[PDB]
């Protein structure tokens, strides 16, 4: 049917709604009169397994998990269907184990029980082998598509029968499968977790998609070792996912989608415009303005490009600005965005890093602010070499008309930074009073968002959340096999050996983080090196908070370097110039912002200030 | 294979314990060898383990710091020093032994008798 095939939307979607719901009337039980509700976080949490799951599946039908093409891409044509077969039938491994082992843990908890809802603890198991029976339907619809376009080599009715069959010896003969148990072939010793190392960074360079080649590397891991700790290992897949933290994922991205979505970006670019843009050069005053301006509101930076990027070129180039800084400018602003508080970076940071998130956000604050003062200097300095005219100062009656406009607006940001810092909202409660002003901002106050567009923004926040659920949950499998064995510890030992003092450490990463986000994705980067760096940073006495702080800026600048910049190509679609000339109109612009990151590495009580 | 553990009792808070376990039937350098910890009413947890990992002892992330592993192979023994005694490590630890090499304590075939450690 067509129901069942648009299934996850309208589920996610409908239980999205249905945990914001019990989210908002906790807090409002909580904090308007004293009569707090126990089975509110709970309840929340068992929901958010359900969708996080629908979102993978999604993702899974949608070919939309995060992958690394920088070598992929450069194979023949000819070449490149062999490989990409492997990656579809590595998937499919997946699926399996994540079928089987969820069915496991399904039918091995029916005993605990959940102390506030008085249920048992497998209904939030029941929906890893559930949903997981969907991502095998969608999986293979995915491949179907792929043979029709000359993509993959194995006709698909061959790897249906190949997935019936080992789903089957699965469910009734599992015992078929010690054939493969690598155990019994090799016996590599200790050092088997630098043989599941060096063949996860070869899945992960020949296009293999990075939160499967993690879980392809664990199940690698307990096959050369010992298959019976899998069993109690895989429960990691499942309670990663039971975290009130991550709950501010779905959420900070659905209020960076009501906005620009019910034109609540656009009277913010008014304010701006009309407050400044009577400078030198300041047109891309507005520009940063706005940018810090919608930084308290969003926590991406493609959000930013996306939603103002057209607004501010068109503005920009309505003065005579020429098309290099206009693409430029626009670019380097957009970095504000996971900056500022909110920020999904710093999100993904503390989940793995076990660190506070209201401190990453209050430690992330002033970069912030330090790095929209250096672009603004900037901009200025490049408009008056460069003699742009000054435009005429607004009516000082359009400059109160554009703040009256954007007025309700701009109190979003007080809601979010002065709830976190004056203690009275938790991240993910801030999360949800956010959705729900920026619900009343575009329905009630505006009027400009309507019920189905609404349900379409859920449905779409619940899918871009679910690229980075199945990462999470398998990074989470990933790094207690990485950190039992110590491999931190020896990387360490031998960074410590080749730089001496912290701050060469400090410089070290830096550099070597510089080099790879020229060629990585800023997301599929924190899940490739920070699961491993993190910890030396811990040895080496660095904070984690300024380390997170530090490596978010690092990596921000990753999406503006040119052999793969994502700001580039967002700004180059948005605003109808070529990459190669937004690439060259923001070497300006990376000063301030080196400039920045070198007075924040070795100054770092700047950074911890509001959290300490 | 056989295991045998010794000291234990109660101790204040940071009594700075030295478990011991002497073992036999095997080879002290092919078996990883270690200690897993089980509260009175908790799932079992590991605690270190020495021939594990490839260069330095495993230990746990709640014990690290303050407790040390030690071998002693001329005795075939195996010592775990506990500093900071926190009253939450109250529990029985188990010494245990496997011929695969790897960090994972609780999982070891073998296991010996355990010993009471209680912090007052
Ligand atoms: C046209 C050509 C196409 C080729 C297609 C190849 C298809 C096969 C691909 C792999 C299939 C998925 C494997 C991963 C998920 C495994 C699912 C769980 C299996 C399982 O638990 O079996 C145990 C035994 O198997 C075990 O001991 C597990 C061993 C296997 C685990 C995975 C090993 C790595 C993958 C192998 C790579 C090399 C071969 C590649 C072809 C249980 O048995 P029990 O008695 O212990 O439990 C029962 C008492 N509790
Ligand atoms: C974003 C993607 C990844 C970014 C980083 C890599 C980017 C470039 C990729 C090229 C490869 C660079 C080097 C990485 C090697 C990873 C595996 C290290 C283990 C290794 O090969 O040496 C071991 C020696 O142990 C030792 O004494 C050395 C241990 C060194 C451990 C380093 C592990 C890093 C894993 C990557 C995490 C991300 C980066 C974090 C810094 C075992 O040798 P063998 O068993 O192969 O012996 C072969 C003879 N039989
Ligand atoms: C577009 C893409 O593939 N990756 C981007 C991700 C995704 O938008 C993610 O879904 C939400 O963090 O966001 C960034 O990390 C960010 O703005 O901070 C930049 C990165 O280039
Ligand atoms: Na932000
Ligand atoms: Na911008
Ligand atoms: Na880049």
């Given at each position: 049917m067509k129901v069942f095939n648009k299934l996850e939307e309208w589920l996610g979607g409908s239980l999205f709604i249905g945990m914001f719901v019990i989210l908002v009337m906790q807090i409002f039980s909580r904090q308007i009169f004293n009569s707090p509700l126990i089975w509110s976080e709970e309840l929340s949490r068992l929901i958010f397994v359900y969708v996080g799951l629908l979102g993978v599946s999604m993702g899974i039908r949608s070919q939309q998990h995060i992958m690394i093409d920088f070598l992929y891409a450069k194979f023949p044509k000819s070449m490149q269907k062999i490989i990409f077969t492997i990656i579809q039938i590595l998937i499919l491994a997946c699926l399996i184990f994540f079928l089987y082992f969820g069915y496991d843990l399904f039918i091995k908890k029916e005993?605990?029980?959940?102390?506030?809802?008085?249920?048992?603890?497998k209904w939030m198991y029941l929906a890893l082998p559930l949903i997981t029976l969907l991502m095998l339907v969608r999986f293979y619809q995915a491949y179907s598509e792929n043979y029709a376009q000359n993509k993959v080599y194995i006709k698909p009715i061959f790897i249906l029968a190949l997935m019936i069959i080992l789903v089957l010896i699965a469910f009734?003969?599992?015992?078929?499968?010690?054939?493969?148990?690598?155990s019994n072939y090799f016996?590599?010793?200790?050092?088997?977790i630098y043989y599941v190392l060096i063949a996860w960074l070869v899945m992960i360079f020949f296009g293999v998609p990075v939160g499967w080649s993690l879980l392809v590397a664990c199940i690698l891991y307990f096959a050369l070792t010992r298959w019976k700790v899998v069993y109690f290992a895989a429960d990691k897949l499942v309670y990663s996912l039971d975290s009130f933290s991550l709950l501010s994922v779905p959420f900070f991205i659905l209020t960076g989608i009501l906005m620009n979505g019910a034109g609540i970006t656009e009277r913010i670019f008014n304010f701006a415009k009309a407050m400044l843009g009577h400078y030198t050069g300041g047109m891309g005053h507005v520009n940063v303005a706005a940018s810090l301006i919608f930084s308290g509101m969003s926590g991406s930076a493609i959000a930013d490009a996306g939603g103002l990027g057209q607004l501010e070129i068109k503005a920009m180039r309505d003065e005579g600005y020429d098309d290099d800084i206009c693409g430029g400018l626009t670019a380097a602003s957009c970095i504000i965005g996971p900056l500022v508080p909110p920020s999904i970076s710093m999100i993904i940071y503390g989940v793995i890093a076990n660190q506070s998130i209201a401190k990453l956000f209050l430690a992330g604050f002033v970069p912030g602010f330090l790095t929209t003062i250096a672009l603004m200097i900037m901009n200025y300095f490049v408009c008056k070499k460069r003699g742009y005219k000054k435009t005429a100062k607004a009516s000082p009656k359009e400059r109160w008309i554009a703040f009256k406009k954007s007025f309700w607006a701009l109190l979003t940001p007080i809601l979010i930074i002065g709830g976190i810092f004056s203690g009275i909202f938790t991240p993910t409660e801030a999360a949800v009073i956010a959705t729900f002003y920026s619900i009343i901002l575009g329905g009630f106050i505006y009027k400009e968002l309507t019920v189905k567009s609404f349900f379409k923004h859920c449905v779409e926040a619940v899918a871009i959340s679910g690229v980075t659920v199945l990462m999470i949950m398998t990074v989470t499998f990933f790094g207690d096999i990485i950190a039992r064995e110590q491999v931190a510890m020896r990387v360490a030992e031998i960074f410590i050996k080749y730089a001496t003092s912290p701050m060469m450490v400090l410089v070290m990463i830096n550099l070597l983080l510089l080099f790879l986000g020229m060629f990585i994705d800023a997301l599929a980067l924190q899940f490739l090196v920070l699961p491993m760096l993190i910890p030396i940073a811990e040895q080496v006495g660095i904070d984690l908070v300024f380390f997170g702080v530090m490596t978010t800026l690092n990596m921000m600048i990753g999406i503006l370097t040119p052999p793969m910049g994502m700001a580039l190509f967002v700004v180059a679609q948005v605003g109808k110039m070529s990459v190669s000339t937004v690439a060259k109109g923001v070497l300006p612009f990376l000063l301030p912002i080196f400039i920045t990151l070198v007075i924040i590495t070795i100054f770092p009580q700047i950074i911890l200030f509001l959290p300490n | 294979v056989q295991l045998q553990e010794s000291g234990g009792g109660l101790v204040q808070a940071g009594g700075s314990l030295r478990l011991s376990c002497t073992t036999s039937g095997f080879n002290f350098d092919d078996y990883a060898i270690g200690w897993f910890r089980q509260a009175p009413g908790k799932e079992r947890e590991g605690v270190s383990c020495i021939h594990?990992?490839?260069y330095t002892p495993y230990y746990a992330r709640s014990v690290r710091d303050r407790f040390t592993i030690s071998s002693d192979n001329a005795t075939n023994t195996v010592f775990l020093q506990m500093n900071?005694?926190?009253?939450?490590?109250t529990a029985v630890y188990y010494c245990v032994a496997d011929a695969?090499?790897?960090?994972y304590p609780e999982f070891y075939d073998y296991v010996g008798q355990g010993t009471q450690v209680t912090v007052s």
């Open positions: 005993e605990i029980e959940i102390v506030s809802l008085g249920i048992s603890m009734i003969k599992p015992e078929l499968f010690k054939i493969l148990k690598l016996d590599l010793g200790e050092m088997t | 594990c990992t490839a900071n005694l926190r009253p939450e490590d695969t090499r790897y960090p």
